[PDB]
Amino acid sequence: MKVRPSVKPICEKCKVIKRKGKVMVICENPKHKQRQG
Amino acid sequence: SRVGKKIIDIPSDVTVSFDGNHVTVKGPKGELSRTLNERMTFKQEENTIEVVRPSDSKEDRTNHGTTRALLNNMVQGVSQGYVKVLELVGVGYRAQMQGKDLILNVGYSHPVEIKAEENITFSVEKNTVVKVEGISKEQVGALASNIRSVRPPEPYKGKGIRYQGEYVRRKEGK
Amino acid sequence: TKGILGRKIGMTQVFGENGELIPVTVVEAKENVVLQKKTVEVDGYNAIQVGFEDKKAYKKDAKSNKYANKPAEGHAKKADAAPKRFIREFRNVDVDAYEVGQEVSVDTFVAGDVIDVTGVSKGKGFQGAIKRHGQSRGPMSHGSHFHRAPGSVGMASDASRVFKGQKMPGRMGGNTVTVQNLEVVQVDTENKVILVKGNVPGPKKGLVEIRTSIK
Amino acid sequence: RQTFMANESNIERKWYVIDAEGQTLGRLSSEVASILRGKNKVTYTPHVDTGDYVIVINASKIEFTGNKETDKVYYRHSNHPGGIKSITAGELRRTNPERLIENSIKGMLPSTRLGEKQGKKLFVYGGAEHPHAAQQPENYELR
RNA sequence: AUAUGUUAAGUGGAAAAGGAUGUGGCGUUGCC
RNA sequence: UUGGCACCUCGAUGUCGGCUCAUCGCAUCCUGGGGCUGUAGUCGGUCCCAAGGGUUGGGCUGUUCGCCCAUUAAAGCGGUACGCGAGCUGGGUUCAGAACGUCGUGAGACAGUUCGGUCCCUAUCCGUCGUGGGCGUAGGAAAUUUGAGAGGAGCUGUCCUU
RNA sequence: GGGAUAAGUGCUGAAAGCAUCUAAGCAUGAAGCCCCCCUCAAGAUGAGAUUUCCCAACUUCGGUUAUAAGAUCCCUCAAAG
Structure with a gap:
């Protein structure tokens, strides 16, 4: 995953959520995983 | 709602x-x-x-x-019951049973043991097929994920343990 | 098995049954009795007091520790025993001894080869940091006035103090030390000795506590 | 000229008992401290203790509002270089709750020769039963 | 202490570009 | 780090580097746990958690730096008056002598170089390392113990087999 | 070897008819955290516990005495210093 201070979608299958206070993007492409909103 | x-x-x-x-x-x-x-x-x-x-x-x-x-x-x-079926892809992947335990011969240097628990039953349709049958979705899911986590599917040849159909990735090493 | 109390006699060597050479410590264990049996109801922990060597009887005017006094003399008599020097408590046993005296014999260590040995003395006087802590000496090439001195004892101004646990001179040795995983070589009745494989803490005629290995 | 000053002979101290079940830590602690300092007595003299004795039963039921079982760490140094140990306020309650309440309450008593003699009148037990039945402890209700 | 709202981070009780289906308000439109 | 200000010290705060002896931060070098890979495997890259222990011996130089030889699981980066001279050395530099290149008419100066050269102390009080004596612990004593708390240790390789 | 966890991985699950490791609930997971291993430790003034030993004469003091159990002075020493 990518820990970056600006998480945002990269394609159309990626969608944004919040876990434990962290903003995250989860996708069906494992390249597109991000956290630390 | x-x-x-x-x-x-x-x-x-x-x-x-x-x-x-x-x-x-x-x-x-x-x-x-x-x-x-x-x-x-x-x-x-x-x-x-x-x-x-x-x-x-x-x-x-x-x-x-x-x-x-x-x-x-x-x-x-x-x-009715909730049944989660786990399959085993790869050569020499056999699931043996004993009493109320499941032995997995899954490519390691030792077997892997999965003890049953209350309210759930193990059943092996064939050496590569394992079915966990129970009454709570939570319990069945815990058991299925614990049995799956021993060798999750690789992306290249797919050998490992998996659920149903084809939902896995695919790579190309060579 | 059960712990025993003993005296260090000296080191020697025997020859193992394929030709090996085995350093050995000879430990005599005699006169061991069970003087008290502490239990959870009377005292919080469960343990057994054993009593090592035999003291002499009570004397009206005794100017040494050779003769038992009235308190000690009354504590042994409740077990139906003879006054004993070196009373010690063994925990982590199974209480099937008797609070009334029963002989603890070396023959209980036939079963149980690996033991640990607690000794209670080493013995050295006030010592310097090179001896006491294994520090390093200064050079003699240049005209160094520093050789066996301790060295810097801290930082300057920002610390403004010495920390607890600094290494300095003081009385060395004499502590309590346990050597773990020692092995019984052979027990001996008619002399009441145990041959321990190695070396135990303390000087000769010292008290050693043998018990089965906690590992 | 005319201000009454309490003396050891005049002082009559009573015994109370409080239930620390279903209460908050700091809200119970401030009131128990006001009871221990003796600010609840008309005959209150600053130089000598006129306070009462307190027995705090059921210490294992004090609770914390919010995410305080994992936060609210307690730190303490041993005076040797490096040693600063810690324990969360949730692991201290399940282990040694009677220290939790005791330290909480004694942090509200002045640190003076008399601020210790006033703080050693607090008896905290985790569980409904206390040995001090021979002192006739009245049952006080916090407000 | 009294009355009406805000928030849930212990913010309160340090700090920016920028990122976000955190929650409250008013307003304004497009399909019901 | 190179600086900028000129706030403490000129009835005086000893300057390198190394030795001896440490302590702390994490922005992690090794070891441990993982996500992605343009990850087939053995090796790698790059991010996230993590400070428990460990982190070499020589040649050249005053060397801190640096380059090299042979290793190592690895040869981390920083703070503490660039830690540390009531602990040590004193090579360097900032004493006096004397010589070279250059500058000055000159006495003499360095953009530099070279040979040499007295480093003081019977520790009060706090601090630290050991050891005793007084009193207390509601009679006076002998032994054996619980453990609130505190300290210590904590590293890794290489072969054989599956 | 035991317990709770970080990053990570999840099971059921809605807010949001679907999806979703999270909001409720239930797991798993480090040489690191608390135990387990070794030493100190009741001046821990909160001064703990157990076993044993000693326990009458004189007063109106209401207290005193010496002596009991025990320990030192003094002397011969070492495993200690």
């Missing part, structure tokens, strides 16, 4: 006792299925029940839609 404002429709074959705060559903193949619920407002009837949220907020809608789903799940637990 809609999912919480839905009828449960107790099939009248299973008996749901509403012991104050707690619910206990019995059926032809499961007893003592009592769950800790919250302070919701539901009717204690047979042949159908409903759950009602007392207030309206952002903390009543969530628990409403969750309480309805949990009561539905434990009703269908005695209405």
Whole structure:
């Protein structure tokens, strides 16, 4: 995953959520995983 | 919401006792299925029940839609079983049984042991096929994920343990 | 098995049954009795007091420790025993000894080869940091006035103090030390000795406590 | 000229007992400290203790509002270089709750020769039963 | 202490570009 | 780090580097746990958690730096008056002598170089390392113990087999 | 070897008819955290516990005495210093 201070979608299958206070993007492409909103 | 404002429709074959705060559903193949619920407002009837949220907020809608789903799940637990099938891809991947334990010969330098527990049954259709049958979705899911996590599917040739169909990735090493 | 109390006699060597050479410590264990049996109800822990060597009887005017006094003399007599020097408590046993005296014999260590040995003395006087802590000496090439001195004892100004646990001179040795995983070589009745494989803490005629290995 | 000053002969101290079940830590602690300092007595003299004795039963039921079982760490140094140990306020309750309440309450008593003699009248037990039945402890209700 | 709201981070009880289905208000439109 | 200000010290705060002896931070070098890979495997890259222990011996130089030889699981980066001279050395530099290149008419100066050269102290009080004596612990004594708390240790390789 | 966890991985689950490791609930997961291993430790003034030993004469003092159990002075020494 990518820990970056600006998480945002990269394609159309990626969608944004919040876990434990962290903003995250989860996708069906494992390249597109991000956290630390 | 809609999912919480839905009828449960107790099939009248299973008996749901509403012991104050707690619910206990019995059926032809499961007893003592009592769950800790919250302070919701539901009717204690047979042949159908409903759950009602007392207030309206952002903390009543969530628990409403969750309480309805949990009561539905434990009703269908005695209405029928939830079966999760785990498959084994790869050469020489065989699942042996012994008493109420499952031995997995899965390419390691030793077998792997999976002990059964209450209310659940293991069953091996063929050496590469394992089925866990139970009454709670939570328990069946815990068992299936613990049996799956021994060798999850590789992306290249797919050998490992997997659920159903083809949902895996695919790579190309060479 | 059960712990025993003993005296260090000296080191020697025997020849193992394929030709090996085995350093050995000879430990005599005699006169061991069970003087008290502490239990959870009377005292919080469960343990057994054993009593090592035999003291002489009570004397009206005794100017040494050779003769038992009235308190000690009364504590042994409740077990139906003879005054004993070196009373010690063994925990982590199974209480099937008797609070009334029963002989603890070396023959209980036939079963149980790996033991640990607690000794209670080493013995050295006030010592410097090179001896006491294994520090390093200064050079003699240049005209160094520093050789066996301790060295810097801290930082300057920002610390403004010495920390607890600094290494300095003081009385060395004499502590309590346990050597773990020692092995019984052979027990001997009619002399009441145990041959331990290695070396135990303390000087000769010292007290050693043998017990079965906690590992 | 005319201000009454309490003397050891005049002082009559009573025994109370409080239930620390279903209460908050700091809200119970401030009131128990006001009871221990003796600011609840018309005959209050600053130089000598006129306070009462307190027995705090059911210490294992004090609760914390919010996410305080994992936060609210307690730190302490041993005076040797490096050693600063810690324990969360949730692991201290399940292990040694009677220290939790005791330290909480004694942090509200002045640190003076008399601020210790006033703080050693507090008896905290985790569980409904206390040995001090021979002192006739009245049952005080916090407000 | 009294009355009406805000928030849930212990913010309160240090700090920016920028990122986000955190929650409250008013307003304004497009399909019901 | 190179600086900028000129706020404490000129009835005086000893300057390098190394030795001896440590302590702390994490922005992690090794070891441990993982996500992605343009990850087939053995090796790698790059991010996230993590400070428990460990982190070499020589040649050249006053060397801190640096380059090289042979290793190592690895040869981390920083703070503590660039830690440390009431602990040590004193090579360098900032003493006096004397010589070279250059500058000055000159006495003499360095953009530099070279040979040499007295480093003081019987520790009060706090601090630290050991050891005793007084009193207390509601009679006076002998032994054996619980453990609130505190300290210590904590590293890794290489072969054989599956 | 035991317990609770970080990053990570999840099971059921709604808010949001689907989806979702999270909001409720239930797991799993580090040489690191608390135990387990070794030493100190009741001046821990909160001064703990157990076993044993000693326990009458004189007063109106209401207290005193010496002596009992025990320990030192003094002397011969070492495993200690």
